[PDB]
């Protein structure tokens, strides 16, 4: 929210860069790892921002309150203003820990729940991957190399679909002037990929209803998750009903 980026320099894939926060300055890197994880214990990449691995001390558990108190400032060495802190255990469980009140500088402690002790959690801030489509209009390839649309008659588009490689349970939102519909893409029930122990890989294609005039239906994407997403393509279909043929 108030994080300022300065001096972003990259060596090979890794991209080093320094940030200001309003409380502290730190150095961070972005690595384009493929089929690998930052830390050995985590099952997958845990796409959570400002991530680092912390080993909670054994004594950091209270029988009275039955909570494992974790300090954000003691594990990061800095202080943060706002954001949803996500704490990820080894098995893949993820819990969001929004601050109790008035930023993290005032209240930097996290209560957790049951006994955790030493488990090597991964702590970071969740970031929102958002992408909105252009209007689903009829596009003609033409011959000079540019794409041209036609807008003589209205088009009532009926359904749309999205193709995805793996994804991590993102969501699809359809918005027009009046209302707003949300469709969630995730692993199908009764699928070999979806197993109780393991993470959901969910390869396939998803079709969702988008109804109304083409010019007003707005389709967007959002993840806000620690799981990776991967959208390949999309499509649509509807009733054109042109009035006058174009010479």
């Amino acid at each position: 929210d108030g994080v300022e980026v300065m001096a972003a320099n990259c060596i090979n894939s890794t991209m080093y860069m320094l940030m200001r926060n309003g409380y502290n300055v730190w150095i961070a890197a972005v690595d384009f790892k493929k089929e690998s994880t930052d830390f050995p214990f985590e099952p997958y990449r845990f796409h959570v921002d400002a991530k680092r691995s912390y080993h909670i001390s054994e004594t950091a558990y209270d029988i009275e309150t039955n909570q494992t108190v974790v300090n954000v400032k003691d594990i990061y060495g800095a202080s943060f203003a706002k954001g949803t802190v996500a704490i990820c255990e080894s098995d893949g469980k993820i819990t969001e820990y929004e601050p109790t009140g008035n930023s993290w500088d005032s209240t930097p402690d996290i209560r957790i729940s049951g006994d955790v002790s030493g488990k090597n959690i991964v702590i970071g801030f969740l970031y929102d991957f958002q992408y909105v489509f252009s209007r689903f209009l009829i596009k003609q390839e033409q011959n000079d190399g540019t794409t041209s649309t036609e807008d003589s008659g209205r088009l009532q588009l009926r359904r749309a679909w999205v193709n995805y490689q793996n994804t991590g349970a993102f969501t699809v939102s359809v918005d027009n002037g009046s209302r707003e519909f949300n469709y969630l893409v995730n692993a199908r029930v009764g699928s070999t990929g979806l197993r109780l122990g393991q993470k959901a890989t969910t390869t396939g294609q998803y079709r969702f209803p988008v109804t109304g005039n083409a010019l007003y239906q707005k389709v967007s994407l959002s993840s806000f998750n620690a799981s990776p997403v991967s959208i390949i393509g999309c499509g649509w279909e509807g009733n054109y009903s042109r009035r006058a043929n174009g010479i």
Partner: protein, 155 residues
């Protein structure tokens, strides 16, 4: 009755016999035949362990210490979320909350008069206090009516 237990006063340490999903569902209260008061956590008592508690305040004026389970249906112990790995234990605990509420409902019925076996209503060797005089023959009769009517016939 598993969800409700009562202990005589005189000890600071008391056990919790029933399994509970959250510490907030457990209710600790001081019970006397005249008055009854609830105890708040931390200030009035603290948890020695998972199954044991200790009372910080004094128990004067109260005959018994009661521990009862009151599972809240409004709040769910297991919050299912996308992007978090689902577990078999999470599914098992999710059903367990509904099962615990049903168990309290069965016990709460047992505190009142439920039907036993072939219909009827049983008071488990418990007398019925207060009650009102019966206007009609079908209506139950209190001991005052018996004493007056058969006391005069008796004497």
């Amino acid at each position: 009755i598993k969800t409700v237990i009562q202990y005589p006063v005189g000890t600071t340490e008391f056990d919790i016999p029933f399994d509970y999903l959250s510490r907030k569902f457990v209710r600790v209260s001081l019970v006397s035949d005249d008055n009854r008061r609830l105890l708040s956590n931390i200030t009035e008592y603290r948890y020695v362990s998972k199954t044991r508690v200790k009372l910080l305040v004094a128990t004067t004026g109260f005959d018994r210490v009661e521990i009862r389970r009151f599972t809240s249906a409004s709040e769910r112990i297991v919050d299912f979320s996308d992007g978090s790995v689902l577990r078999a234990n999470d599914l098992n605990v999710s059903q367990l909350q509904s099962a615990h509420i049903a168990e309290e409902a069965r016990d709460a019925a047992l505190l009142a008069m439920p039907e036993d076996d072939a219909g009827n209503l049983d008071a488990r060797n418990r007398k019925i206090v207060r009650l009102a005089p019966g206007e009609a023959g079908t209506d139950a009769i209190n001991k005052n009516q018996l004493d007056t009517t058969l006391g005069e016939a008796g004497g």
